[PDB]
Write a protein that binds this ligand. Structure first.
Ligand code: SAH
Ligand code: SAH
Ligand code: FER
Ligand code: FER
Ligand code: MG
Ligand code: MG
Lengths: 218, 218
């Protein structure tokens, strides 16, 4: 998917000087490139950056919303500590069944707990937990319509100092539309405007893939 | 300076949804915008990302190469722990004198140790130190001709797990030139190619400002 709004020629170069995916990440991405939905997955550049954040941050407790075939979860899982844990939320049983196949295949399935079913229902159960779980990092990358909800609910399930990571903030450049007619564009426009003055977090909008925002909880 | 190779219209939006600089950072950047060289400074987006990395990483020992009027050093310094320290290296006494004026003015001059004189001479003294200093993060942003040296020397002065940050890796898009005639372009082209297969680090090329690479030491 390259980089939204980035020069095609400069993106090719950026790729030239970027790191290849490890074996199983590359394999997962390579073997499923044919199946529909593959374009929804984060780019290889985002996966590398994502794994770099798990390491740099020291994260052990991760919460992913929007799993699909497990590519992003796998990227992070490969950098988790021996006691690292990922709670993966996804509504699709078929794509997620493929995710499970590759996680166990890479030996990180032990560090990933898939929660099949609507993400909101799962978040509600997490907040209803005794004691209240608190993740070091949360990756929001599912249905855009519910981003405001996932951010808010996840923000209280995030430790102070934790990092929220949201994908698709530049939404194919549609965010520049004056009167957006598409629902996801409208929801993302308001989401970005709201987050730009959310004084509970210190943010950084990064142009990798379809745009990703890093929100560090104060 | 926007973002090298990024859409001007999308960059304006990205700015719209980005965080403003704190008082003294904005003030420093605002009051010196008239002086020559101001365009060399990292963009506001990079400063925000830079401060976010100091926090997320837990860095206490920082090494900056390429100080100028102190903007980047100030961005990082404002996020340092009470015991945080920055060793700032710069050859220019006049621009650096202005840097000092703003650091003390923001109350972080206590956490910044300016080393005036050729960066190589200063790095040589740091490596000649007893005991050998080891930084958590190193920001290389000076004369491009010496990037290979600053990276190599700094890499051994960096702790394992530490983070190397290099600016200007996309060098005004000149990195795409087939037969670059400019020295900095040639040096940066080789630098990026060498770093892309440097197995001592895990990298990520980020398109913010004039391109910045994050190299996490294994
Ligand atoms: N309401 C909902 N609850 C849970 N999952 C949902 C959902 N709406 C959409 N999803 C999931 O959101 C996912 C977005 S694609 C995720 C891609 C993955 N992060 C990667 O980069 O590899 C889809 O798999 C879809 O099944
Ligand atoms: N050989 C050398 N040794 C030390 N400093 C050098 C040098 N060559 C260039 N420099 C310094 O490299 C700096 C690059 S500009 C630095 C901008 C600063 N990082 C910011 O973003 O605010 C200049 O101030 C120049 O004085
Ligand atoms: C459903 O959520 C997503 C949708 C897309 C769609 C991409 C495209 O249409 O090319 C991409 C990434 C997503 O996370
Ligand atoms: C000397 O090092 C630098 C030079 C420039 C030049 C920018 C321009 O010419 O517009 C920018 C950033 C630098 O770190
Ligand atoms: Mg996405
Ligand atoms: Mg620079």
């Amino acid at each position: 998917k390259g980089i939204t709004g980035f020069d095609p020629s400069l993106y090719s170069y950026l790729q030239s000087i970027s790191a290849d995916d490890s074996f199983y990440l590359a394999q997962l991405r390579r073997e499923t490139a044919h199946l529909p939905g593959a374009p929804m997955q984060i780019s290889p550049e985002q996966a590398q950056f994502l794994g770099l954040l798990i390491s740099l941050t020291g994260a052990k407790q991760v919460l992913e919303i929007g799993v699909f075939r497990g590519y992003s979860a796998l990227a992070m899982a490969l950098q988790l500590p021996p006691d690292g844990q990922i709670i993966a939320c996804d509504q699709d049983p078929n794509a997620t069944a493929i995710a499970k196949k590759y996680w166990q295949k890479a030996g990180v399935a032990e560090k990933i707990s898939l929660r099949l079913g609507p993400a909101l229902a799962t978040l509600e159960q997490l907040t209803q937990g005794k004691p209240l779980p608190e993740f070091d990092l949360i990756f929001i990358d599912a249905d855009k319509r519910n981003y405001p909800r996932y951010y808010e609910i996840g923000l209280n399930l995030l430790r102070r100092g934790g990092l929220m990571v949201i994908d698709n903030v530049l939404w194919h450049g549609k965010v520049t539309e004056v009167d957006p007619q598409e629902a996801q564009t409208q929801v993302l426009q308001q989401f970005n405007r709201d987050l730009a003055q959310d004084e509970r977090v210190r943010i950084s909008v990064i142009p990798l893939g379809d745009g990703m925002t890093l929100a560090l909880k104060k």
